[PDB]
Enzyme design. Structure first.
Site, PDB file in Angstrom:
ATOM      1  N   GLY A  45       0.810  -1.235   0.000  1.00 36.64           N
ATOM      2  CA  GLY A  45       0.000   0.000   0.000  1.00 36.64           C
ATOM      3  C   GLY A  45       0.829   1.265   0.000  1.00 36.64           C
ATOM      4  O   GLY A  45       1.988   1.246   0.390  1.00 36.64           O
ATOM      5  N   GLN A  50       2.922   9.918   1.841  1.00 32.46           N
ATOM      6  CA  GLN A  50       4.245   9.258   2.088  1.00 32.46           C
ATOM      7  C   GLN A  50       5.366   9.632   1.113  1.00 32.46           C
ATOM      8  O   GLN A  50       6.540   9.582   1.444  1.00 32.46           O
ATOM      9  CB  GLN A  50       4.120   7.730   2.112  1.00 32.46           C
ATOM     10  CG  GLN A  50       3.128   7.195   3.136  1.00 32.46           C
ATOM     11  CD  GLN A  50       3.225   5.696   3.276  1.00 32.46           C
ATOM     12  OE1 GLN A  50       2.334   4.984   2.859  1.00 32.46           O
ATOM     13  NE2 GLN A  50       4.326   5.209   3.838  1.00 32.46           N
ATOM     14  N   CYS A  91       5.182  -0.225   8.467  1.00 28.75           N
ATOM     15  CA  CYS A  91       4.974   0.921   7.605  1.00 28.75           C
ATOM     16  C   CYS A  91       6.263   1.222   6.945  1.00 28.75           C
ATOM     17  O   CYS A  91       7.303   1.016   7.544  1.00 28.75           O
ATOM     18  CB  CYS A  91       4.503   2.133   8.411  1.00 28.75           C
ATOM     19  SG  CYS A  91       4.375   3.635   7.418  1.00 28.75           S
ATOM     20  N   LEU A  92       6.191   1.707   5.710  1.00 28.44           N
ATOM     21  CA  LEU A  92       7.384   2.047   4.921  1.00 28.44           C
ATOM     22  C   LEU A  92       7.978   3.345   5.415  1.00 28.44           C
ATOM     23  O   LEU A  92       9.190   3.498   5.478  1.00 28.44           O
ATOM     24  CB  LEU A  92       7.062   2.165   3.441  1.00 28.44           C
ATOM     25  CG  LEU A  92       6.715   0.862   2.701  1.00 28.44           C
ATOM     26  CD1 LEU A  92       6.366   1.173   1.254  1.00 28.44           C
ATOM     27  CD2 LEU A  92       7.838  -0.168   2.749  1.00 28.44           C
ATOM     28  N   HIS A 133      -5.163   1.803   7.220  1.00 26.72           N
ATOM     29  CA  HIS A 133      -3.777   2.232   7.396  1.00 26.72           C
ATOM     30  C   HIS A 133      -3.425   3.367   6.412  1.00 26.72           C
ATOM     31  O   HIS A 133      -2.819   4.356   6.807  1.00 26.72           O
ATOM     32  CB  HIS A 133      -2.816   1.020   7.242  1.00 26.72           C
ATOM     33  CG  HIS A 133      -1.358   1.353   7.346  1.00 26.72           C
ATOM     34  ND1 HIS A 133      -0.531   0.754   8.266  1.00 26.72           N
ATOM     35  CD2 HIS A 133      -0.573   2.184   6.620  1.00 26.72           C
ATOM     36  CE1 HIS A 133       0.702   1.207   8.108  1.00 26.72           C
ATOM     37  NE2 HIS A 133       0.706   2.067   7.108  1.00 26.72           N
ATOM     38  N   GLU A 134      -3.787   3.224   5.144  1.00 24.27           N
ATOM     39  CA  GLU A 134      -3.477   4.287   4.163  1.00 24.27           C
ATOM     40  C   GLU A 134      -4.329   5.553   4.375  1.00 24.27           C
ATOM     41  O   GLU A 134      -3.889   6.667   4.062  1.00 24.27           O
ATOM     42  CB  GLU A 134      -3.578   3.779   2.712  1.00 24.27           C
ATOM     43  CG  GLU A 134      -2.602   2.655   2.340  1.00 24.27           C
ATOM     44  CD  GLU A 134      -1.139   2.972   2.670  1.00 24.27           C
ATOM     45  OE1 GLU A 134      -0.747   4.152   2.712  1.00 24.27           O
ATOM     46  OE2 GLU A 134      -0.355   2.038   2.918  1.00 24.27           O
ATOM     47  N   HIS A 137      -2.793   7.581   6.923  1.00 20.32           N
ATOM     48  CA  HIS A 137      -1.723   8.405   6.316  1.00 20.32           C
ATOM     49  C   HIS A 137      -2.231   9.735   5.743  1.00 20.32           C
ATOM     50  O   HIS A 137      -1.601  10.767   5.934  1.00 20.32           O
ATOM     51  CB  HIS A 137      -0.964   7.652   5.220  1.00 20.32           C
ATOM     52  CG  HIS A 137       0.072   6.713   5.746  1.00 20.32           C
ATOM     53  ND1 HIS A 137       1.206   7.148   6.398  1.00 20.32           N
ATOM     54  CD2 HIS A 137       0.169   5.364   5.682  1.00 20.32           C
ATOM     55  CE1 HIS A 137       1.949   6.105   6.728  1.00 20.32           C
ATOM     56  NE2 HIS A 137       1.348   5.013   6.298  1.00 20.32           N
TER      57      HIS A 137
HETATM   58  C1  LIG Z   1      -1.224  -4.298   7.015  1.00 25.42           C
HETATM   59  C2  LIG Z   1      -0.800  -2.863   6.787  1.00 25.42           C
HETATM   60  C3  LIG Z   1      -0.471  -2.663   5.324  1.00 25.42           C
HETATM   61  C4  LIG Z   1      -0.167  -1.209   5.043  1.00 25.42           C
HETATM   62  C5  LIG Z   1       0.664  -1.059   3.768  1.00 25.42           C
HETATM   63  C6  LIG Z   1       2.150  -0.875   4.088  1.00 25.42           C
HETATM   64  C7  LIG Z   1       2.834   0.139   3.189  1.00 25.42           C
HETATM   65  C8  LIG Z   1       2.827   1.434   3.927  1.00 25.42           C
HETATM   66  O1  LIG Z   1       3.669   1.675   4.766  1.00 25.42           O
HETATM   67  N1  LIG Z   1       1.796   2.191   3.681  1.00 25.42           N
HETATM   68  O2  LIG Z   1       1.540   3.219   4.542  1.00 25.42           O
HETATM   69  C9  LIG Z   1       2.881  -2.176   3.940  1.00 25.42           C
HETATM   70  O3  LIG Z   1       2.899  -2.771   2.859  1.00 25.42           O
HETATM   71  N2  LIG Z   1       3.480  -2.602   5.054  1.00 25.42           N
HETATM   72  C10 LIG Z   1       4.104  -3.900   5.123  1.00 25.42           C
HETATM   73  C11 LIG Z   1       3.394  -4.601   6.252  1.00 25.42           C
HETATM   74  O4  LIG Z   1       3.102  -3.990   7.259  1.00 25.42           O
HETATM   75  N3  LIG Z   1       3.053  -5.862   6.063  1.00 25.42           N
HETATM   76  C12 LIG Z   1       3.648  -6.852   5.171  1.00 25.42           C
HETATM   77  C13 LIG Z   1       2.399  -7.203   4.381  1.00 25.42           C
HETATM   78  C14 LIG Z   1       1.238  -6.989   5.354  1.00 25.42           C
HETATM   79  C15 LIG Z   1       1.838  -6.417   6.641  1.00 25.42           C
HETATM   80  C16 LIG Z   1       2.072  -7.514   7.696  1.00 25.42           C
HETATM   81  O5  LIG Z   1       3.120  -7.176   8.605  1.00 25.42           O
HETATM   82  C17 LIG Z   1       5.644  -3.853   5.209  1.00 25.42           C
HETATM   83  C18 LIG Z   1       6.177  -2.509   5.700  1.00 25.42           C
HETATM   84  C19 LIG Z   1       6.276  -4.945   6.072  1.00 25.42           C
HETATM   85 ZN   LIG Z   2       2.405   3.353   6.206  1.00 23.37          ZN
END
Ligand SMILES: CCCCC[C@H](CC(=O)NO)C(=O)N[C@H](C(=O)N1CCC[C@H]1CO)C(C)C
Ligand SMILES: [Zn+2]
Length: 170
Positions: A45, A50, A91-92, A133-134, A137
């Site tokens: 996402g 961001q 989160c990124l 989550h987005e 943001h």
């Molecule tokens: C579930 C929340 C998903 C929000 C999307 C985020 C991307 C982000 O930081 N958006 O704000 C993401 O892909 N985050 C991943 C994440 O949090 N993950 C991996 C895939 C799903 C979730 C499980 O820990 C990465 C950073 C590890």
């Molecule tokens: Zn995030």
């Protein structure tokens, strides 16, 4: 290019995205840059906030195959219950930090897509976790804000140290 992803504690992560007024040449370039930046990171996402664009724009792809793109513009998300389902998130904009966060489990999502077709769906599990989550943001919110203020204080530090070594690496 692929765009820089802003990082906690940067105060441009608190800007309240303003809505989009029409889909012009620029917003299409940006939704495309963002997908690249999200697939590059990698993540599932991304909100325009961001990558320093305070506009209500969200891209998303949940698939292992990196082949189910989704594009939300001026979204609106309504909780369909008080039945918060916990979920380990990251989160990124907050690298290598993870902990559990509680949000509504069932949610209605309303928005337009890139071409301006309206949709209005009811969302479960990871989609409903990702979207909230987005949306957070776009309204200046980080998942760390759901935590105790020291567990997040320590997160200002773990990240600031990570970014130091990003810079010494780049
Ligand atoms: C579930 C929340 C998903 C929000 C999307 C985020 C991307 C982000 O930081 N958006 O704000 C993401 O892909 N985050 C991943 C994440 O949090 N993950 C991996 C895939 C799903 C979730 C499980 O820990 C990465 C950073 C590890
Ligand atoms: Zn995030």
């Amino acid at each position: 290019a692929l765009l820089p992803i802003l990082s906690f504690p940067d105060p441009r992560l608190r800007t309240i995205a303003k809505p989009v007024e029409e889909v012009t040449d620029e917003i299409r370039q940006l939704a495309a840059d963002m997908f690249e930046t999200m697939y590059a990171a990698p993540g599932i996402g991304l909100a325009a906030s961001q990558v320093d664009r305070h506009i209500q724009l969200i891209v998303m792809d949940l698939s292992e195959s990196k082949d189910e793109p989704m594009v939300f513009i001026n979204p609106k998300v309504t909780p369909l219950t008080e039945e918060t389902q916990p979920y380990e998130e990251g989160c990124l904009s907050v690298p290598q930090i993870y902990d559990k966060v509680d949000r509504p489990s069932r949610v209605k999502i309303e928005a337009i897509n890139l071409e301006g077709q309206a949709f209005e769906i009811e969302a479960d599990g990871l989609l409903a976790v990702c979207i909230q989550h987005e949306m957070d943001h776009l309204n200046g919110k980080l998942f760390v804000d759901y935590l105790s203020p020291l567990k997040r204080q320590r997160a200002r530090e773990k990240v600031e140290k990570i970014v130091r070594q990003r810079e010494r690496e780049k």
